[PDB]
Amino acid sequence: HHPCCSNPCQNRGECMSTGFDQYKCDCTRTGFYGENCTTPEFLTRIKLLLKPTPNTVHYILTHFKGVWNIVNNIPFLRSLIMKYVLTSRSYLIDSPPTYNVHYGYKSWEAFSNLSYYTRALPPVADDCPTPMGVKGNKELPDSKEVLEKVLLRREFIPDPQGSNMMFAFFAQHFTHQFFKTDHKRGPGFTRGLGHGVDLNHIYGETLDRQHKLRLFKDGKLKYQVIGGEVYPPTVKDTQVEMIYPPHIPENLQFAVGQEVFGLVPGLMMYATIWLREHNRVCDILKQEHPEWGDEQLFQTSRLILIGETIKIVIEDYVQHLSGYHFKLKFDPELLFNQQFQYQNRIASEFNTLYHWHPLLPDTFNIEDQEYSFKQFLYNNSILLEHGLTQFVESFTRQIAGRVAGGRNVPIAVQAVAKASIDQSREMKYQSLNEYRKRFSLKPYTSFEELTGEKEMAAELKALYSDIDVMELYPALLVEKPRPDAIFGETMVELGAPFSLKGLMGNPICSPQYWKPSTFGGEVGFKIINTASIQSLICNNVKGCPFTSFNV
Amino acid sequence: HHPCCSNPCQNRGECMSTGFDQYKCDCTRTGFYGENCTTPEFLTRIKLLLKPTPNTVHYILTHFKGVWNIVNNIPFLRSLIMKYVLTSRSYLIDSPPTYNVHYGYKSWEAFSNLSYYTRALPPVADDCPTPMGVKGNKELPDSKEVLEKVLLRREFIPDPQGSNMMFAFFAQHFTHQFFKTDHKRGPGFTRGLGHGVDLNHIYGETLDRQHKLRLFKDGKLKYQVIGGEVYPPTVKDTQVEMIYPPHIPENLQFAVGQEVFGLVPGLMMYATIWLREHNRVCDILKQEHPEWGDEQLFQTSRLILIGETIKIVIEDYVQHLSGYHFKLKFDPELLFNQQFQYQNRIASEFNTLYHWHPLLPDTFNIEDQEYSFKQFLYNNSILLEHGLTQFVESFTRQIAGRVAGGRNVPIAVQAVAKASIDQSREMKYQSLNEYRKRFSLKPYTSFEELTGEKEMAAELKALYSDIDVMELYPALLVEKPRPDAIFGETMVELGAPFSLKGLMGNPICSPQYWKPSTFGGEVGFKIINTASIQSLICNNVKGCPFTSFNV
Ligand code: HEM
Ligand code: HEM
Ligand SMILES: *[C@@H]1O[C@H](CO)[C@@H](O[C@@H]2O[C@H](CO)[C@@H](O[C@H]3O[C@H](CO)[C@@H](O)[C@H](O)[C@@H]3O)[C@H](O)[C@H]2NC(C)=O)[C@H](O)[C@H]1NC(C)=O
Ligand SMILES: *[C@@H]1O[C@H](CO)[C@@H](O[C@@H]2O[C@H](CO)[C@@H](O)[C@H](O)[C@H]2NC(C)=O)[C@H](O)[C@H]1NC(C)=O
Ligand SMILES: *[C@@H]1O[C@H](CO)[C@@H](O[C@@H]2O[C@H](CO)[C@@H](O)[C@H](O)[C@H]2NC(C)=O)[C@H](O)[C@H]1NC(C)=O
Ligand SMILES: CCCCCCCCO[C@@H]1O[C@H](CO)[C@@H](O)[C@H](O)[C@H]1O
Ligand SMILES: CCCCCCCCO[C@@H]1O[C@H](CO)[C@@H](O)[C@H](O)[C@H]1O
Ligand SMILES: CCCCCCCCO[C@@H]1O[C@H](CO)[C@@H](O)[C@H](O)[C@H]1O
Ligand SMILES: CC(C)Cc1ccc([C@H](C)C(=O)O)cc1
Ligand SMILES: CC(C)Cc1ccc([C@H](C)C(=O)O)cc1
Ligand SMILES: *[C@@H]1O[C@H](CO)[C@@H](O)[C@H](O)[C@H]1NC(C)=O
Ligand SMILES: *[C@@H]1O[C@H](CO)[C@@H](O)[C@H](O)[C@H]1NC(C)=O
Ligand SMILES: *[C@@H]1O[C@H](CO)[C@@H](O)[C@H](O)[C@H]1NC(C)=O
């Protein structure tokens, strides 16, 4: 079998076979040397001595509110700290990208073929003696047994960080522009060839789709007006393909950039809000530029909404998730004197870790109604009946579920949780602890250390036998949360590098794009740099209801 | 008409309309301010005082051979200087890319759509009063008159730098992997979606083409043996499409990665040499890695040949062209402490400036034969008859034509030279002097200043009236050459940024790729770092004939 099956090289050293039964580790620029890249250079020894653990840094960031209150109000200091957050996180991501599901060695095919998700760790080779390499049993435990014993919800567990359904549906809407698995090809393939925040879930992945969604007047997107309210246009009107069951009324087959967004009314809620936002920005640019044509109005509005998106994701969405007293900043200028690649490739493991289905409540509570999953799915009538204003008021008030901590996946989506496990295995993912090492975390030494409790830990012990073959996805959902937090350590320390790299890697953040003229002047630039989740709702939802990502 | 038609903003500032007849310049990070970005900041003033002209620096690099001989032998100093050549040239290129033929403003369409060549300067807007904006006559001079008066060859003018036909066909073969215009769409469109040195001209642009060209044993490319010599396989054997006239017999339709390389036996000579090199490297890797399969052998050899290509282009090809006494270096490590983007988009203007057809001789002289263009084109019989050893010996001896200095386009390709002019206009290129300012050059103040003489200058004066509407492409070919040089100032100062950025921008030059394990270990790595045009010929051509890019 492959000599690298045991994953011998440490500290991001790379393993290469050098014969049928021999390997060599390439320790180049790891800060380590020796056969397995485990002997630290002098400087590396010193660095390791002084480095705080993630849990220590997390502590500091979530305490001393009074100090952070001062720090937040000193621009130079706030910039310094945000610059360090961006650079230190982004360093953990290979860019240009390297591995994918078919290539555990660098190749021009892996580099150039955008239909692959990339891989933060290479796949376990096909001929390895066990699923995780050489450790553990010949087969992993039955994925249904793992699902049922430690993932499925008994009683709803609320997010102690107070995340609401505005947050949950924003997470789903936002991420599904770059998590778009090409199931015809397999789980390691994506249909999101822009590999990031290009707003294809509003505008369409292809030019043909985009042009069917556009009005071709004033830069705007097509729309319909039902009961005096602006909604996306229909499938029949646009000839845009959408996923809908056969029984859906013609005028409820809303057509939007992302074909799956008819799945759930919470998605259609944001699709509608962003469509309105695009057309609003068109109106503003037309006022500013009476001389501009439709094409420039459309393109410049798209750039502005991309900037708005990144602004809101950092300063509202990630701010909320972080739990930090430090005030995050969206500021491309922070990187202009740093080394940083303005490109990104979406990682399979980023997709996996973002399967946050424990957020979902047992019912969807709008106004006085409590809808079941069966009532809520593919049902845009609910959106039309209550209206956007009521959707926002209700979802702002409704608490979402905790993601880490175990046993909180709604049984309505149990098949999704099982697929995340089955597809992880199909893509030959390395183990939880290999991923922890990859992101500078200490391997867990027991199941009880992983969960912080005894009962799930024992079920896991019996299923997996060795902590070193525990799987990434179920680990994320059973991991001991930070104190009163929605996530455990592995979720944040993997998620944050992927997230921030992906956000700042966008070309609009590069120096030649990050200028007023890119966005039609100071007016368009300011739309980006003053965007918030509250302003997005205030500008585009009748009555300007209050909103927030927390209850 | 468009308010920016006159190109009012200077020093890389960006022009935006602000009403039907007003404009605003965005001077962000130009080092200048004021209505047109022409007022220097203080630091800027100082820099402009200290900065030597391109002609001055060129003079320095091409004299003092004794001093350079010392510098070339001080590793530290060589590295310092080469590093500054790389960063200073690359800084001139927008990366991530910006404009293209359809977008004179930044847009997501222009950023994301890889079918476009990018544009170093935006197109002249469609409603401008004159072709170049507001200056000059309503129509540009007849391109047939420009061609005949100042471009077409009378007597053959040999290159004073002694470039040979090994050089001319290397330029053609190498560049035609990333200059591949998509004529179905138009001159501003490319079929080279890798936008760089990906060796698609050997391996094919698409995966389907690649797999038809591959043997699927030992990593190798398919081939045939003719008289004991290895040649590319045929179209019939591979089902790989090629462009050939109907009279070419089945046995002479060689199939290689680039569809057009059957056009000229000089291209097919390099196609054969590189095909042999791929299979040679496969043999080496297989010795080092008996445990490897065909796919990894194939992919690793491709990465090695990409490295060889960049190595040879810098240290042989560009070295020769430069005329410098300084010894250039291919060393990705020079950029590891620098700000640099490992990406590139091929510019239309890079394509245009590389139309180096004056290199071509009046006849192609192999052994004792002198082939006309009519006899040479599409004639792979010539290659089989003389063989590669004789091709190399003959092309190494045969001098190529001077490119700058006027009147040296071969009449056999007058239609190509006319097309370069006509297509530049179709793509709405800005004038020569706009491009000179874009690359930090002083505008020419007269046609005599451009040509360094009187006769051609007066013909151009009559044709164009105003030096500020002189076109880029014909100016390149009539420009006053550097002393005893193949090119004038504009060619080098535009060409060098595009070239070096494109070479170092390749992902194999990035830190996570530039490691021995990427290339199958130290033996694979050393193949890249010792590659040369002589070793390429020596290893793959019977008898190891001596070669170089000069006569
Ligand atoms: C009513 C709400 C939801 C339903 C019915 C639902 C259902 C599904 C289904 C059926 C899949 C396909 C999985 C497969 O078999 O391959 C999926 C994928 C996924 N879901 Fe959910 N989900 C919901 C909410 C959410 C939320 C709130 C998030 C938060 C981020 C989320 C994140 C994801 C991700 C990242 C994927 C992978 C997408 C891809 O690769 O294309 N989902 N979901
Ligand atoms: C016998 C030798 C050659 C012949 C017959 C030839 C002929 C042609 C022709 C017919 C075109 C297409 C022009 C059009 O778009 O209408 C072309 C394009 C071009 N040629 Fe040549 N040429 C030769 C040698 C060279 C050499 C030595 C170079 C050196 C750099 C060169 C550089 C180019 C470039 C860069 C293009 C544009 C390619 C593209 O846009 O796809 N050619 N040539
Ligand atoms: C990116 O990589 C994808 C995975 O390799 C690749 O998809 C694969 O494409 C090949 C070749 O086009 C398909 O194989 C085909 O060729 C044989 C002929 O011998 C047919 O019998 C097959 O049915 C098929 O037509 C694979 O089917 C396909 N694999 C998957 C999983 O989709 C993409 O083409 C690559 N993308 C680019 C842009 O290169
Ligand atoms: C490099 O790592 C390998 C593990 O992959 C080490 O070899 C193993 O060492 C353990 C105990 O240390 C033994 O139980 C195994 O039998 C060893 N495996 C093999 C294949 O020999 C190796 O010692 C490490 N090298 C260094 C220098 O620390
Ligand atoms: C990149 O841009 C070109 C130019 O617009 C696109 O080519 C057009 O495609 C549409 C349909 O998508 C056709 O109706 C046009 O005839 C095409 N025009 C030309 C000039 O080719 C191309 O599709 C775009 N590529 C991507 C991936 O979106
Ligand atoms: C007090 C907070 C100062 C800046 C906090 C940076 C937050 C992210 O810093 C992270 O800390 C981890 C553990 O030390 C490291 O492993 C990561 O590389 C680093 O990105
Ligand atoms: C020996 C001095 C170092 C060699 C010079 C680097 C080669 C390219 O130097 C060039 O010189 C031009 C004029 O100054 C500039 O306009 C270019 O931006 C710069 O790249
Ligand atoms: C070596 C003699 C040629 C130099 C004369 C300059 C060319 C101007 O003459 C042109 O030459 C073209 C090519 O033959 C012809 O097709 C045109 O009909 C002719 O006008
Ligand atoms: C977990 C990930 C998906 C979201 C996330 C959460 C926190 C952070 C902060 C700013 C950090 O970098 O520590 C970034 C991104
Ligand atoms: C003109 C271009 C196509 C070729 C070329 C010529 C010279 C140089 C040197 C290294 C420089 O930067 O001055 C680079 C590239
Ligand atoms: C769809 O929603 C409506 C309310 O708008 C509800 O009454 C109806 O029962 C739902 N449909 C299904 C199939 O549950
Ligand atoms: C700026 O450009 C215009 C031409 O567009 C010119 O008239 C003006 O004098 C220039 N300089 C200043 C300082 O405005
Ligand atoms: C092709 O070259 C051969 C020499 O190998 C020559 O005899 C023949 O005439 C040429 N063909 C044409 C059509 O010129």
Curated annotation (Swiss-Prot), chains A, B:
Gene Ontology terms for molecular function: dioxygenase activity; enzyme binding; heme binding; metal ion binding; peroxidase activity; prostaglandin-endoperoxide synthase activity; protein homodimerization activity
Membrane disposition: Peripheral membrane protein
Active-site residues from the entry: H176 (proton acceptor), Y354 (for cyclooxygenase activity)
Cofactor needs: heme b
Enzyme Commission no: 1.14.99.1
Record note on quaternary structure: Homodimer.
Protein name: Prostaglandin G/H synthase 2
Site (Aspirin-acetylated serine): S499
Pfam families on file: An_peroxidase (PF03098), EGF (PF00008)
Keyword Nucleus in record: yes
Pathway as given in its UniProt record: Lipid metabolism; prostaglandin biosynthesis
Cofactor: binding details: Binds 1 heme b (iron(II)-protoporphyrin IX) group per subunit.
Organism: Mus musculus
List of residues binding substrate: R89, Y324
Tissues with expression: Following colon injury, expressed in the wound bed mesenchyme during the first phase of repair, probably by colonic mesenchymal stem cells (at protein level).
Family to which the UniProt record says this protein belongs: Belongs to the prostaglandin G/H synthase family.
Disulfide-bond pairs as recorded: C4-C15, C5-C128, C9-C25, C27-C37, C538-C544
One GO CC annotation: endoplasmic reticulum membrane
Phenotype of null mutants: Mutant mice exhibit defects in colonic mucosal wound repair.
Subcellular location: Microsome membrane; Endoplasmic reticulum membrane; Nucleus inner membrane; Nucleus outer membrane
Post-translational modification: S-nitrosylation by NOS2 (iNOS) activates enzyme activity. S-nitrosylation may take place on different Cys residues in addition to Cys-509. Acetylated at Ser-548 by SPHK1. During neuroinflammation, acetylation by SPHK1 promotes neuronal secretion of specialized preresolving mediators (SPMs), especially 15-R-lipoxin A4, which results in an increase of phagocytic microglia.
Activity regulation text: Inhibited by the nonsteroidal anti-inflammatory drugs aspirin, naproxen, diclofenac, meclofenamic acid, indomethacin and their analogs.
PANTHER family: PROSTAGLANDIN G/H SYNTHASE (PTHR11903), PROSTAGLANDIN G_H SYNTHASE 2 (PTHR11903:SF8)
Chain positions carrying an annotated carbohydrate: N36, N113, N379
GO biological process, one term: response to nematode
Primary location: membrane
Catalytic reaction list: (5Z,8Z,11Z,14Z)-eicosatetraenoate + AH2 + 2 O2 = prostaglandin H2 + A + H2O; (5Z,8Z,11Z,14Z)-eicosatetraenoate + 2 O2 = prostaglandin G2; prostaglandin G2 + AH2 = prostaglandin H2 + A + H2O; (5Z,8Z,11Z,14Z,17Z)-eicosapentaenoate + 2 O2 = prostaglandin G3
